[PDB]
């Protein structure tokens, strides 16, 4: 079962996004389908649900008048509009597949950034360097960035922190790999960082200290 | 428009079990079997965890079980071991057609293997010194239980200092980074700066210099 999601990223208070999901591994025109919300301090809010045919369409409380939801069987899409969009509509949305009464399936979500600043791509700099090299993706926004290491081909010893806000109003992470020392010559380390918000890209190759 | 109730935390140890409830409204718990229960580890998708009340879908381990009476659901988990702190919600139809998700309890396992930080300091990198700005970079992993002191030293003066909150690696431990914002001739100027981080009664300390 996949559940790709899209859309998303910054938006001006006020403005409006549209999201989709495409769904694959299952009968997506069996199913009812939902869309949930979780803002970055709290819980876990349903948000919306379309059932089987899209003729019966349901909305939280705090969405309605707002948001509209609709669903494509033909190309196994889902999508939610969400409009008029406020501050704390920054959330990460989930398309969710319905069982029968629950959510067995979750997409991994998008981060939907309400707020009137403007978008800036990562600087991505080298930490050289059993050694531990890394990356320092530094003063971006909004979040996120995904970070992978030789094209997801490695994965050992990877651990991706989460970010810090600076009071600058810019995310800065850092992504650190332990290698073994003996392969500092040998080896090839490329750490791939996907920007979506801005569509930036940007692989570093870190090689051992001068 | 209001949540399924909660208990925000419970912390428990090793091998005990434990018993979350979830209190609501006859509109939901009350007159349906529509209980669900997720799990959410850190920076993942929520998963379903018990459907119908009481229902385990294959793959989810036995410890868990489900229940519920009059407008409150119970939701128990045996022999806690260290993979089982996460967080956990509550979830429900309600009639007129919404769902409705508790407030969230966070467990915490606490009778785990005690691990000392491993600490790895980076000096800012060339590259980010070409672009007239320094960032040292303090990567903290390992350690158990979660909580850390990260201090900064200049030579041996105490000091634009960000820190994350610990996370989940999370195997059996945490990790942390701190970062230490430097004008590149402040860098230039003192002969040496920590990076001292305190857990439990141990501190480990960190050196770099220009």
């Known amino acids: 079962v996949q559940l790709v999601e899209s859309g998303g990223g910054l938006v001006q208070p006020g403005g409006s996004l549209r999201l989709s999901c495409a769904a694959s591994g299952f009968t997506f025109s069996t199913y009812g389908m939902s869309w949930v919300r979780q803002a970055p301090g709290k819980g876990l809010e349903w948000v919306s649900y379309?059932?089987?045919?899209?003729?019966?369409?349901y909305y939280t409380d705090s969405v309605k008048g707002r948001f509209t939801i609709s669903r494509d069987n033909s190309k196994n899409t889902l999508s939610l509009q969400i409009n008029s969009l406020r501050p704390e509509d920054t959330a990460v949305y989930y398309c969710?597949?319905?069982?029968?009464?629950?959510?067995?399936?979750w997409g991994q979500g998008v981060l939907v950034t309400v707020s009137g600043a403007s978008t800036k791509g990562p600087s991505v700099f080298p930490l050289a360097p059993t050694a531990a090299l890394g990356c320092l993706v530094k003063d971006y926004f909004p979040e996120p960035v995904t970070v992978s290491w030789n094209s997801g081909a490695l994965t050992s010893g990877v651990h991706t922190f989460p970010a810090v806000l600076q009071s600058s109003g810019l995310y800065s992470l850092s992504s650190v790999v332990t290698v073994p020392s003996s392969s500092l010559g040998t080896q090839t380390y490329i750490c791939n960082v996907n920007h979506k918000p801005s569509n930036t890209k940007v692989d570093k190759r870190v090689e051992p200290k001068s | 428009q209001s949540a399924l109730t909660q208990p925000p935390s419970v912390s428990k140890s090793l091998g005990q079990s434990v018993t979350i409830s979830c209190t609501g409204t006859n509109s939901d718990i009350g007159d349906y079997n529509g209980v669900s229960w997720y799990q959410q580890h850190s920076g993942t998708a929520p998963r379903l965890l018990i459907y119908?009340?009481?229902k385990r879908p294959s793959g989810v381990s036995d410890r868990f079980s489900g229940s519920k009476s009059g407008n409150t659901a119970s939701l128990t988990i045996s022999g806690l071991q260290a993979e089982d702190e996460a967080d956990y919600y509550c979830?429900?139809?309600?009639?007129?057609?919404?769902?409705?998700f508790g407030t969230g309890t966070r467990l915490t396992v606490l009778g785990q293997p005690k691990g000392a930080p491993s600490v790895t300091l980076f000096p800012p990198s060339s590259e980010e010194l070409q672009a007239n700005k320094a960032t040292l970079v303090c990567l903290i992993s390992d350690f158990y239980p979660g909580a850390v002191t990260v201090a900064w030293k200049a030579d041996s003066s105490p000091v634009g200092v960000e820190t994350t909150t610990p996370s989940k690696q999370s195997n059996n431990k945490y990790a942390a980074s701190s970062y230490l914002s430097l004008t590149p001739e402040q860098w230039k100027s003192h002969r040496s700066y920590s990076c001292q981080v305190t857990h439990e009664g141990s501190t480990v300390e960190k050196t770099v210099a220009p």
């Open positions: 969710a597949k319905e069982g029968w009464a629950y959510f067995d399936y």
């Open positions: 379309i059932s089987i045919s899209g003729g019966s369409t």
């Open positions: 119908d009340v009481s």
């Open positions: 979830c429900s139809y309600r009639t007129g057609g919404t769902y409705i």
